[PDB]
Ligand SMILES: O[C@@H]1[C@@H](O)[C@H](O[C@@H]2CO[C@@H](O)[C@H](O)[C@H]2O)OC[C@H]1O
């Protein structure tokens with residue numbers, strides 16, 4: 001009957017999926033992508049390695065294809081991601097330290113300006129913290145210093161006054177050292193007038209290990225004056241699949257969805273793609289996989305039932 005996107009929208013939220021250009025030829029895949037979800041996130045082609053492959057020369061070719069596709073289906077789009085230590089073209093490291101801030105600002109200005117009025121959110125800075133809450137020592141942190149994050153958000157806001165600006169990261173679903181650091185940063189930004197509208201919890205989880213403090217963590221951020229979104233949701237398991245593992249995964253998805261629906265400022269959920277067929281998990285986590293609601297043959301898993309039930 002009703003799709004996840006329609007059920008979510010009925011409750012003032014979106015339910016989307018990320019997708020990548022190489023997947024679009026798969027007709028069965030795109031059919032579900034366009035009808036089941038209300039929001040889309042470019043999995044890769046909006047990243048620095050693609051949009052500014054050589055200094056000062058921008059390329060939005062691939063990203064454009066995804067945005068148009070979403071627009072064709074009446075789906076909103078989240079920009080992802082402007083500043084990140086990964087998938088960064090090699091020339092960025094060669095930029096003289098004293099010039100990096102200008103370069104980062106420029107990269108942000110061109111990409112944000114280019115998609116102005118077409119996206120709902122922008123993951124401005126991605127994965128800036130270590131698990132212990134300290135700053136990740138990326139090229140930006142090292143050469144620009146602690147203010148690089150704030151400067152990135154300022155630059156984004158200056159290029160597009162209406163798009164929601166998000167700080168995105170993983171392992172910040174539960175209350176702990178990492179989410180605490182993000183919490184303090186957001187608190188600091190609001191105090192100093194640094195633009196920031198939301199926190200993106202990637203939610204790359206492990207079946208059976210969903211943080212019990214998830215709901216409370218989402219709420220404390222909401223109380224700070226920012227929205228929250230689960231941006232790259234997947235719940236991986238150690239292969240092979242079993243009815244028991246599938247069932248645990250279903251319970252987990254249901255719990256995650258309920259946690260969001262309980263908090264007024266949790267605006268939506270995006271799964272990092274929706275079918276195991278194209279999940280990034282097997283590639284990065286050896287021996288793990290089957291992390292999405294649809295399996296490799298597009299069969300809806302028990303996890304889908306749980307999500308739909310939670311959305312009601
Ligand atoms: O490159 C990053 C991955 O290393 C990261 O994987 C996180 C590692 O800790 C696990 O507990 C998390 O579940 C897992 O997602 O994900 C983000 C990616 O950019």
Ligand SMILES: O[C@@H]1[C@@H](O)[C@H](O[C@@H]2CO[C@@H](O)[C@H](O)[C@H]2O)OC[C@H]1O
Nearest residue numbers: 043044081126127169170202232280
């Ligand atoms: O295909 C892979 C992408 O799905 C992957 O996306 C990253 C996963 O970790 C998250 O923390 C990042 O925000 C997200 O962009 O990047 C690697 C690519 O090979």
Ligand SMILES: [Zn+2]
Nearest residue numbers: 019020273278
């Ligand atoms: Zn994909």
Ligand SMILES: [Zn+2]
Nearest residue numbers: 059060061062
């Ligand atoms: Zn090109």
Ligand SMILES: [Zn+2]
Nearest residue numbers: 064065067068
């Ligand atoms: Zn276009």
Ligand SMILES: [Zn+2]
Nearest residue numbers: 110113114115
């Ligand atoms: Zn342009």
Ligand SMILES: [Zn+2]
Nearest residue numbers: 175176177180
């Ligand atoms: Zn704490």
Ligand SMILES: [Zn+2]
Nearest residue numbers: 295296297299
């Ligand atoms: Zn199957």
Ligand SMILES: [Zn+2]
Nearest residue numbers: 302304305306
């Ligand atoms: Zn069912």
